[PDB]
Design a protein around this ligand. Structure first.
Ligand SMILES: *[C@@H]1O[C@H](CO)[C@@H](O[C@@H]2O[C@H](CO)[C@@H](O[C@@H]3O[C@H](CO[C@H]4O[C@H](CO)[C@@H](O)[C@H](O[C@H]5O[C@H](CO)[C@@H](O)[C@H](O)[C@@H]5O[C@H]5O[C@H](CO)[C@@H](O)[C@H](O)[C@@H]5O)[C@@H]4O)[C@@H](O)[C@H](O[C@H]4O[C@H](CO)[C@@H](O)[C@H](O)[C@@H]4O[C@H]4O[C@H](CO)[C@@H](O)[C@H](O)[C@@H]4O)[C@@H]3O)[C@H](O)[C@H]2NC(C)=O)[C@H](O)[C@H]1NC(C)=O
Ligand SMILES: C[C@@]12CN(C(=O)OCc3ccc(OC(F)(F)F)cc3)C[C@H]1CN(C(=O)c1ccc(S(N)(=O)=O)cc1)C2
Ligand SMILES: [Ca+2]
Ligand SMILES: [Cl-]
Ligand SMILES: [K+]
Ligand code: NA
Ligand SMILES: [Zn+2]
Length: 805
């Protein structure tokens, strides 16, 4: 109940909200049915429209007008945005040359440059180029400020998860808004676009920018706008707020546009009907910038022009129906559309089986346009699993497609030509970033980056300390003229041991054999030096990774590779080796096929054993440094050390062997040498974070050898490929992956074919940032380069996406 009989007189778009049943005048009262009787009359004035004309100039103030052209309007802060243009002979902001904004040029009483976030729904990255002719204001922001060619959204590439990621710096899994539609089994409540449940506070986790500002004494404009409040009125409201007294004026503001998304759904991303919505957004930007110029704020305010996701061509006829795969279709609830999420319709049905659902959805049709996954098997780059609101069974839908339960769902609930929500690597899903203002750089292009990074930067722009988030603070320093955040590298927590020869061969009873009994004083000083770390500068190019947690581990040197070996997990945490362009691939000699050798530097008690693998009928083994890339026949023996062995399912060994035998050489050939760091990952609770030993759900049978959930590799070389990877003078180039360690290749529908037809495709799908691997391993890479730390942070956030131009 709201007693709607108070008045909005003097309270229009009030900043602090009052509690029912007192009536509200804020930009959200509409969505609550709580506005005072006179809200429309007083607060949503429309008379005479949005622009001054010649004859209105110096008029008598008429309080009924939407905006004003009277003499007192500037000090009232409520002129139409074009007032000075029409009446004072001023130019529009867009017609002025751009001039570097070296320092904030602000009115007296401004303590910090204000931030305005101008967010546009569905603004696809290529609109910047393709719509450039009709967006002169936006284009001027873009070429005069700092811009990225695109910004990567989070998955799913829907509006709510992305705007709340912008606001918080968090993955949807951590902020809790994991879709536009959700069921929370703990609440037993449902969240939808339409309706009232979404207003309940328990959906919204983390700490959004407006709360971070408020807690630290920075005032915020109210971020959210009711749909019926037109764009012009939103702009005028922001501009009025900017004219408040110092003690009352907010420092941060948000504007939101429903366009071009709204039209994109109806007409497709590049429908001829899309030009008009683009023109109209540009006109709004024009109105804001002219209004700021009137208030002498246009060289004072930092403006962020940011999208939430792109838009793809999607039509009704490109729908897959679960009723073409499942017999039991009525026993399931599907969250449908550009992603699929499946749960049981009733939790009293113990006949429902996720294993048989997944099997019925796996590679059933030659050109099938979705792929089913247990959520924990989704590519780790999506960070889409660690939330009770995310159903165990997920469908990754191909771009341009929908999934639905039954055909009836599509025609009894073609309308649309556009949609979004797909994998956030997809080009059509990319969106925009432009920063313009005293604190951003002048005419600067920056590489693409992920929207989870912006919260930190908006905190930097406002002098706020960010709440803990998923950005990497400092990785976007290159966007900023000033207010950079200068991080220190994390301190190493565990220092390694450097073991020498401590054990005789006969102390090991591991059930391992090797055909290696062959008899030289020239080559004896030589092998001694290699085991002491003589070739280490060749194979460890960026220093050793730092171990950021408490553990017991050994550095192991070899001719061809260096490893950090975990006494706790009985395998390396990381193995580092360099493959030059000239290096040669050899095969494993016949006599060495099943060779595993005790490591005399490492205790039997801290070693794997061959028996466990013999006994374990499911589990086989592979090596982290590949025996194929050994520098010499004698060096090859090192590759067969028990300390280089890791557990692998035979199905995964097909993937791993092709990567190591074919792909490492291919990359070294193309990139002019590569440095490789590989290792295991244990993420049994799929929280994207390194497991402790007590979290491991699976061991090699009869042993304490834990089974990794994933294997990573980080592949680094010189950005200037004219320089070899091991003699690189400037910036680095990286690509990485986190491959799921699976007992089958069900994920790859073409796996019964030759590895050359499917393995690289799988690896591409599981592309990762070095940062993702850091979270999953507790390691910190690139500790010793000649590059600045912020540059290294940017590198660690890079994701190689494998999308064309
Ligand atoms: C991305 O960045 C984020 C932010 O940095 C990272 O997430 C953080 O990770 C931390 C490590 O997992 C985690 O720390 C834990 O916090 C527990 C306190 O939780 C509340 O308080 C915080 C602080 O304000 C709050 O943010 C939390 O918010 C969550 O929950 C609410 C409501 O439930 C949601 O609205 C919100 O969306 C958010 O949910 C998300 O996080 C939770 C986990 O907290 C998930 O379950 C959800 O799926 C969702 O993703 C909370 O309201 C604290 O209690 C924990 O302490 C345990 O572990 C420590 C180890 O130090 C141990 O000493 C303690 O004894 C304790 O164990 C006890 O509890 C166990 C479970 O009940 C039990 O087994 C034991 O026996 C003990 O009883 C822990 O310190 C932090 O909360 C989140 N923060 C956020 C915002 O998500 C994230 O890791 C990053 N991702 C990547 C890939 O890097
Ligand atoms: C609720 C809302 C009004 N809103 C608002 O006024 O937002 C301000 C804001 C700005 C920035 C921000 O980010 C930060 F902090 F970084 F600046 C946070 C909030 C958002 C709109 C979504 N909404 C929809 O109707 C809607 C429309 C389309 C779709 S879909 N089909 O997925 O495309 C889904 C939902 C109505
Ligand atoms: Ca984990
Ligand atoms: Cl959704
Ligand atoms: K076996
Ligand atoms: Na297969
Ligand atoms: Zn949309």
């Amino acid at each position: 109940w709201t007693a709607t009989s108070g008045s909005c007189k003097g309270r229009c778009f009030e900043l602090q909200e009052v509690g029912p049943p007192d009536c509200r005048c804020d930009n959200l009262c509409k969505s609550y049915s709580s506005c005072c009787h006179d809200f429309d009359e007083l607060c949503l004035k429309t008379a005479r429209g949005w622009e001054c004309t010649k004859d209105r100039c110096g008029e008598v103030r008429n309080e009924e007008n939407a905006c004003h052209c009277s003499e007192d309007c500037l000090s009232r802060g409520d002129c139409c945005t074009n007032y000075q243009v029409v009446c004072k002979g001023e130019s529009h902001w867009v017609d002025d040359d751009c001039e570097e904004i070296k320092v904030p040029e602000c009115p007296a009483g401004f303590v910090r440059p204000p931030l305005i976030i101008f967010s546009v729904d569905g603004f696809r990255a290529s609109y910047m180029k393709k719509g450039s002719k009709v967006m002169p204001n936006i284009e001027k922001l873009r070429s005069c400020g700092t811009h990225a060619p695109y910004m990567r959204p989070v998955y799913p590439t829907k509006t709510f998860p992305n705007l709340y990621t912008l606001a918080t710096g968090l993955y949807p899994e951590s902020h809790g808004i994991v879709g536009n539609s959700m069921y929370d089994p703990v609440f037993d409540a449902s969240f939808h676009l339409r309706g009232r449940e979404k207003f309940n506070h328990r959906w919204w986790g983390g700490q959004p920018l407006w709360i971070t500002a408020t807690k630290q004494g920075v005032r915020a404009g109210t971020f959210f706008w009711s749909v019926s409040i037109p764009h012009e009125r939103r702009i005028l409201t922001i501009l009025q707020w900017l004219s408040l007294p110092d003690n009352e004026r907010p420092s941060v503001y948000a504007f939101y546009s429903e366009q071009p998304d709204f039209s994109g759904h109806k007409y497709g991303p590049f429908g001829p009907e899309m030009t008009n919505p683009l023109r109209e957004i540009d006109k709004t930007v024009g109105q804001l910038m002219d209004g700021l110029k009137q208030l002498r704020l246009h060289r004072c305010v930092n403006v962020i022009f940011v999208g939430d996701h792109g838009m793809e061509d999607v039509t009704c006829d490109r729908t897959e129906f679960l009723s073409n795969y499942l017999t039991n279709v009525d026993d399931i609830t599907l969250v449908p559309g550009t992603l699929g999420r499946i749960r049981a319709k009733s939790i009293n049905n113990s006949k429902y089986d996720p294993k048989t659902i997944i099997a019925a959805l796996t590679c059933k049709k030659p050109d099938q346009h979705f792929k089913p996954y247990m959520k924990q098997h989704l590519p780790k780059r999506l960070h889409y699993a660690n939330n009770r609101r995310i159903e165990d069974i997920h469908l990754l839908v191909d771009r341009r497609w929908h999934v639905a339960r039954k055909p009836l769902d599509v025609y009894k609930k073609c309308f649309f030509q556009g949609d979004h929500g797909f994998d956030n690597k997809v080009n059509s899903m990319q969106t925009v970033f432009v920063g313009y203002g005293p604190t951003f750089k002048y005419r600067t292009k920056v590489p693409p980056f992920e929207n989870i990074e912006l919260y930190n930067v908006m905190c930097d722009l406002l002098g706020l300390k960010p709440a803990p988030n998923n950005g990497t603070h400092g990785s976007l320093n290159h966007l900023l003229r000033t207010n950079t955040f200068r991080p220190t590298m994390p301190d190493e927590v565990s220092r390694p041991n450097y073991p020498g020869i401590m054990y005789l061969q006969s102390e090991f009873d591991l059930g391992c054999t090797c055909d290696d009994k062959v008899e030289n004083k020239l080559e004896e000083l030589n092998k001694r030096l290699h085991t002491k770390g003589s070739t280490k500068e060749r194979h460890l190019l960026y220093g050793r990774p730092a171990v950021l947690y408490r553990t017991s581990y050994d550095i192991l040197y070899h001719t061809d590779f260096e490893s950090g070996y975990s006494e706790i997990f009985l395998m390396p945490l990381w193995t580092s080796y360099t493959i030059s362009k000239q290096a040669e691939v050899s095969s494993i000699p016949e006599h060495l096929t099943n060779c595993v050798r005790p490591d005399v530097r490492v205790s039997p008690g801290f070693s794997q054993n061959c028996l466990a693998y013999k006994n374990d009928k499911q589990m086989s083994y592979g090596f982290l440094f590949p025996p194929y890339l050994s520098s010499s026949p004698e060096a090859k023996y090192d590759a067969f050390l028990v300390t280089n062995m890791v557990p692998m399912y035979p199905a995964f060994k097909r993937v791993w062997a092709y990567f190591q035998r074919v792909l490492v050489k291919k990359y070294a050939s193309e990139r002019n040498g590569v440095n490789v760091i590989s290792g295991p990952i244990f993420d049994y609770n799929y929280d994207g974070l390194r497991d402790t030993e007590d979290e491991i759900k699976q061991y090699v049978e009869g042993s304490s050898i834990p089974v990794p959930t994933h294997y990573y590799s980080i592949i680094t070389s010189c950005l200037d490929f004219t320089q070899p990877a091991d003699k690189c003078d400037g910036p680095l180039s990286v690509s990485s992956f986190i491959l799921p360690h699976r007992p089958d290749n069900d994920e790859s529908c073409n796996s019964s074919e030759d590895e050359s037809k499917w393995v690289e495709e799988l690896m591409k799908m599981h592309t990762a940032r070095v940062r993702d691997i850091e979270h999953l391993t507790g390691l910190d890479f690139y500790r010793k380069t000649s590059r600045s730390y912020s540059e290294i942070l940017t590198l660690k956030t890079y994701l190689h996406t494998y999308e064309s131009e």
